[PDB]
Design a protein around this ligand. Structure first.
Ligand SMILES: Nc1nc2c(ncn2[C@@H]2O[C@H](CO)[C@@H](O)[C@H]2OP(=O)(O)O)c(=O)[nH]1
Length: 104
C-alpha cells in the first residue's frame, strides 16, 4: 500500500523495511556510504515524538525501489535506532530550509 507519503513519494511498509535493513546492517558493520556518510546520526532538532529510544540514525530511502548505495540521497529518510526499531519515515519535501517533516 501507500503506507507512507513523503511529499509526492509513496512507500509501502516493505519499502521501509528493506531500506531500514540495509542501513542497520551498515551501522552494525561500522561501514558508511556516500559523501554524507550514511548511516549517520539523526539529531531530532525537529523534536518528533518518536516512540522508540535515541540515538537515532538516518538512512536514505529511494523512490525508485533501489536501495541506497552511495549516490544522490534525495529527500526521504528512514530513521531507526540502535535496536533496529523504526522511529519514523521523514522527508525534506514540504519543509523549509534543511528541515524535515514526517511522512504521513
Ligand atoms: N533538519 C535536520 N537535519 C539533521 C538532523 N540530524 C542530522 N541532520 C542532517 O544535517 C543536515 C542539516 O544540515 C540535513 O540536511 C541532514 O542531513 P542529511 O542531509 O544527510 O539528512 C536533524 O535532526 N535535523
Amino acid at each position: 500500500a501507500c503506507d507512507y507519503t513523503c511529499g509526492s513519494n509513496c512507500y509501502s511498509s516493505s519499502d521501509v523495511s528493506t531500506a531500514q535493513a540495509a542501513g542497520y546492517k551498515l551501522h552494525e558493520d561500522g561501514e558508511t556510504v556516500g559523501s554524507n556518510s550514511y548511516p549517520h546520526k539523526y539529531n531530532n532538532y525537529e523534536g518528533f515524538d518518536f516512540s522508540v529510544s535515541s540515538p537515532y540514525y538516518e538512512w536514505p530511502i529511494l523512490s525508485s525501489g533501489d536501495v541506497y548505495s552511495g549516490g544522490s540521497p534525495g529527500a526521504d529518510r528512514v530513521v531507526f535506532n540502535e535496536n533496529n526499531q523504526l522511529a519514523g519515515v521523514i522527508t525534506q519535501t514540504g519543509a523549509s530550509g534543511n528541515n524535515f517533516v514526517e511522512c504521513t
